[PDB]
Amino acid sequence: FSRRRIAYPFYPFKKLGRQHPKKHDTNLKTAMRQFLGPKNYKGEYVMNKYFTVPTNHVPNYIKPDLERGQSLEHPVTKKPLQLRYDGTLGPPPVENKRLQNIFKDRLLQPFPSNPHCKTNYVLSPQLKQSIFEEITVEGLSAQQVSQKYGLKIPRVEAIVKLVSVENSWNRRNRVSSDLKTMDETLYRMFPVFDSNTKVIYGELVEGERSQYKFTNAKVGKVGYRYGSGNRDNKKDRRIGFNKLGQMVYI
Amino acid sequence: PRKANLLKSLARGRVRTSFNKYNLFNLYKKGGVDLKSKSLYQQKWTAKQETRAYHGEHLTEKRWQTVFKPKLDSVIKETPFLLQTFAVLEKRLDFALFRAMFASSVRQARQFILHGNVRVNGVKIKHPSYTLKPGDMFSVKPDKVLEALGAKKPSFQEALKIDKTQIVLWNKYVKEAKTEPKEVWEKKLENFEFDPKWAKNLKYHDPIKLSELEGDEPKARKLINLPWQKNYVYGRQDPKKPFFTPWKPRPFLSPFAILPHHLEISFKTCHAVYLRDPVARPGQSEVISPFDVPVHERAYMYYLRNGK
Amino acid sequence: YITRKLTMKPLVMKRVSNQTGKGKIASFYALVVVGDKNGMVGLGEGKSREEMSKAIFKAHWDAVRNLKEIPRYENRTIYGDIDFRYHGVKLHLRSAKPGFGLRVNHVIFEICECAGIKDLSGKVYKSRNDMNIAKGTIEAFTKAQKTLDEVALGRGKKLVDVRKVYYS
Amino acid sequence: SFNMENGGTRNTLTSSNEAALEDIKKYRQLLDSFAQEAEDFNEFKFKVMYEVTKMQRESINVNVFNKISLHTYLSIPINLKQQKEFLRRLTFFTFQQHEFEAVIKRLYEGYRNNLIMHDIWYITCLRHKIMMDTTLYELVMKAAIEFQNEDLAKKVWNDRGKFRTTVPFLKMDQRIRIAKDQKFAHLMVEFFTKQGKYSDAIAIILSSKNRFNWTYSMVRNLHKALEEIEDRNSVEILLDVVNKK
RNA sequence: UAUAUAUAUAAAUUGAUUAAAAAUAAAAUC
Ligand SMILES: [Mg+2]
Numbered sequence A: 001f002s003r004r005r006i007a008y009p010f011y012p013f014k015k016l017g018r019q020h021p022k023k024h025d026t027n028l029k030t031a032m033r034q035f036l037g038p039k040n041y042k043g044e045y046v047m048n049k050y051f052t053v054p055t056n057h058v059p060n061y062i063k064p065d066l067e068r069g070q071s072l073e074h075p076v077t078k079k080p081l082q083l084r085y086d087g088t089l090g091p092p093p094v095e096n097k098r099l100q101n102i103f104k105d106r107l108l109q110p111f112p113s114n115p116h117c118k119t120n121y122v123l124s125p126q127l128k129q130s131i132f133e134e135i136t137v138e139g140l141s142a143q144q145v146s147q148k149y150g151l152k153i154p155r156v157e158a159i160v161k162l163v164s165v166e167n168s169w170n171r172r173n174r175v176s177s178d179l180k181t182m183d184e185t186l187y188r189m190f191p192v193f194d195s196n197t198k199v200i201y202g203e204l205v206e207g208e209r210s211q212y213k214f215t216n217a218k219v220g221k222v223g224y225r226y227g228s229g230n231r232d233n234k235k236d237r238r239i240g241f242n243k244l245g246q247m248v249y250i
Numbered sequence B: 001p002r003k004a005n006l007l008k009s010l011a012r013g014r015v016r017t018s019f020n021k022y023n024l025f026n027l028y029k030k031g032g033v034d035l036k037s038k039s040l041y042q043q044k045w046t047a048k049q050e051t052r053a054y055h056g057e058h059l060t061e062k063r064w065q066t067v068f069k070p071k072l073d074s075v076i077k078e079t080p081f082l083l084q085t086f087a088v089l090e091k092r093l094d095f096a097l098f099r100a101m102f103a104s105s106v107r108q109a110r111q112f113i114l115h116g117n118v119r120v121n122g123v124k125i126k127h128p129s130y131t132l133k134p135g136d137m138f139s140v141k142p143d144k145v146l147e148a149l150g151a152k153k154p155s156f157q158e159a160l161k162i163d164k165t166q167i168v169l170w171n172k173y174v175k176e177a178k179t180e181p182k183e184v185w186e187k188k189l190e191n192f193e194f195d196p197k198w199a200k201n202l203k204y205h206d207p208i209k210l211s212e213l214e215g216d217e218p219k220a221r222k223l224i225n226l227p228w229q230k231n232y233v234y235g236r237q238d239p240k241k242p243f244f245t246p247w248k249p250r251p252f253l254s255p256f257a258i259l260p261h262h263l264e265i266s267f268k269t270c271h272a273v274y275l276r277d278p279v280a281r282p283g284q285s286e287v288i289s290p291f292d293v294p295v296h297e298r299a300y301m302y303y304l305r306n307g308k
Numbered sequence C: 001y002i003t004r005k006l007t008m009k010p011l012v013m014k015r016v017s018n019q020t021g022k023g024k025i026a027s028f029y030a031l032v033v034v035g036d037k038n039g040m041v042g043l044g045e046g047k048s049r050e051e052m053s054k055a056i057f058k059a060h061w062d063a064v065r066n067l068k069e070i071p072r073y074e075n076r077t078i079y080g081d082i083d084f085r086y087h088g089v090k091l092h093l094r095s096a097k098p099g100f101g102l103r104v105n106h107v108i109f110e111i112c113e114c115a116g117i118k119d120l121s122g123k124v125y126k127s128r129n130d131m132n133i134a135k136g137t138i139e140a141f142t143k144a145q146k147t148l149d150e151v152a153l154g155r156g157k158k159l160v161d162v163r164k165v166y167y168s
Numbered sequence D: 001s002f003n004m005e006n007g008g009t010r011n012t013l014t015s016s017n018e019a020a021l022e023d024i025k026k027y028r029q030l031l032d033s034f035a036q037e038a039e040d041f042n043e044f045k046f047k048v049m050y051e052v053t054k055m056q057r058e059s060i061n062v063n064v065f066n067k068i069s070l071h072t073y074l075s076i077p078i079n080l081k082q083q084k085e086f087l088r089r090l091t092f093f094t095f096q097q098h099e100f101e102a103v104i105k106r107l108y109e110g111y112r113n114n115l116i117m118h119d120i121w122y123i124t125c126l127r128h129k130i131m132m133d134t135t136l137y138e139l140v141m142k143a144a145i146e147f148q149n150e151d152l153a154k155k156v157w158n159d160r161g162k163f164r165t166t167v168p169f170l171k172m173d174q175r176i177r178i179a180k181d182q183k184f185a186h187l188m189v190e191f192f193t194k195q196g197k198y199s200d201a202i203a204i205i206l207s208s209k210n211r212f213n214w215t216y217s218m219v220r221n222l223h224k225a226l227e228e229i230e231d232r233n234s235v236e237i238l239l240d241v242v243n244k245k
Numbered sequence E: 001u002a003u004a005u006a007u008a009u010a011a012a013u014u015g016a017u018u019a020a021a022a023a024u025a026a027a028a029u030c
């Protein structure tokens, strides 16, 4: 039996009571407000645990089940805070032992419902520099470095390319203070990883704007075939991108 | 593509590929998808709703059907084979931007692409549907990445009023410190866990007038001398940048900060490399999704038959 | 063990009448399947006059009682094809590649989901009654299926020999 | 030791410098006398072979001392993971054939026309030893794999290459020789796999693809350890070598 | 170099008197 079910919170929350007729409020909005907490004059929600990013290389992901739906905490002391019948946030009646009892992997699990999802580790900048020096300068092949550092070859090659771009930007100082701040912030939000054919180029006399290039090919294999299927007016219309990035019909 | 409408409605409670606060709450309160007391068709429909709200909301249904690949790829724990239902979308350029944390949404990444801020191997790509091959390197203009991962720049009026309030509270603090300095210092240490000149060093600030400061931002810049924001209106250190200029991470960023496996990211340069297509492995899937394997398999059975 | 690990799913829920002289008396039949998803499954049936809740209650106990181990190949599929006739239902079920869905009739879908059969493709011929489909499904799963180890031992052969050769 | 001594009846294993010197003198006399008498170097080898063989049997019981018991005895430390005991046992209870032949050639040229005392003591201590067959070499290769000693691996595949030249190897049939060489190649592949030198393992596989039939059962370790790092190129070439069939 | 800012008043469209919502939908701002 399927029913159009308004997505009310699974946890218990303080619902509406008798309301002024002109309030025009909904329970979902109250749940929103209780999840967030008071709104600062700056527009912030400091009371929430998720307003501010972490800074100790331990990602902070939503844990509504392990929190029983209580998502408010003191911004400084970081001790839990919960709503009260008085209407002012105050200390909980009892300790929530399950917030203390977090599995090692669940700390790295982004979404509660999907256990298989996990966040990759960020390589330390020193490790990136070490890989770049080992490959570019010493000459150790990507296989050797991957075996050395427990990494995959394509990741190693991507690291080399990115460190090349980083080197160029640092040479020109194209990096800005905002970019450095974002880099340092994001780096601290994630756990840190611990260690032939015949070709003829035709003659180009002066004033020619382009050069013919002839590639050898065999009859029965070269050409556009006659009676080929026309897919343009069909859903499987083939589309590609020219090297300029222009969309073309391939 | 689909015209965005009621994407973040709390009644519907569908999680979207976004860093928004409303999306955060919708993810928070959902718990898990309810597939119980439902026929097979109803289970498939619920799985479609939940999964298709996240993976490709913009894609048209009759377009997603054509894009959908009935044959998946997989390289003791159990392999989650059917989480790869939507792995085909992970090679699209906009999805790559969103997963690289170069945008706060797939739609925002789409606008970044369509507005010419994105390059793939050094050629400006203006088409969100461009598919990334393994080893491709794609980059975004750093200003747009900083805007995506930064707080909204306040208007002049909003930040001016915020400064008004900050002056009011700073004057309050120094007043109370002057009245009762010794225990003020001791109790401040109480949180941190006597020199009477301490309160003497602190200096008042003059309340500003909105009517007189309106429309004169260079004047307002000189008129503010708070200890923390010296000579700039709040959030507008350089008012010619697209973001909160004393660069501040956007609110509610920790919940959605997943580092993808298939991409290798360089935040300092706003570059990324597409290592591979996402592949399921024993006990882990590289398709970042908020739904469990049962939901994905129900969606997969739906799309195999096209709803039959 | 029983409550936390076993999952119960109703398969059949219906009203059956026994018209007595005074009037039409209506009772509630329920057929359920309980399986731990890890190689153990059972079916249960319940009949209650006053409310279906009691029918499902007794059905749950009966399913718990008949809970039996089910042969499984790689813990994801049947060992080989099963062609089975049960009281007018013809079940043709085929093992499948890893990653293959449960591309079967719905009743078989809940049975496989409960019993941990990840991979299967099947067709139901002749009568399509859900009752008979479920009963024959469990029967063909346990009687009509033989493990490769058991087959090899009965033939006095090593698993390396009995295993199929790869051709392409 | 008890079995080698026939329960203590034979006092061979216990030694003294007195016994060493006297036996060296005796075998000096015996061998330098026999050297001239033989017609040709081949016959002198035959006499030395007969002497050493009969000497081994009189020295210690033949039955308890053989390839099989020695294999188990040397296998004890490998499973128990002590290198020193294994090498001590291997040196005390084993001799390489090519080394013996070189020693006998040296003593042949010495008598016909401390190192000489060393060679006499060597021919004397042969009573304690059994020749290194292919199986024993493969066991020492397994020891190298278990202990991850590169020097031991290099020594053993040098000694196996030398042993290929000595006549006991060439006495065997061609298929047995090729099968044992394939086994040794597989052991080398395992060693270079576990050491993490994948390129050399792929090189060994590629060089001898035609001479040896490489099956996936042999290269499963290599294929796994390559897929862990995702070397799609090396995986592809290795799998093509295996499955070209 | 402080920072869980707090107090008041005023209003507050449709439906409804709470798990009944429309609705972050509008407007406004970047
Ligand atoms: Mg309906």
Ligand SMILES: [Mg+2]
Pocket: none
């Ligand atoms: Mg009204």
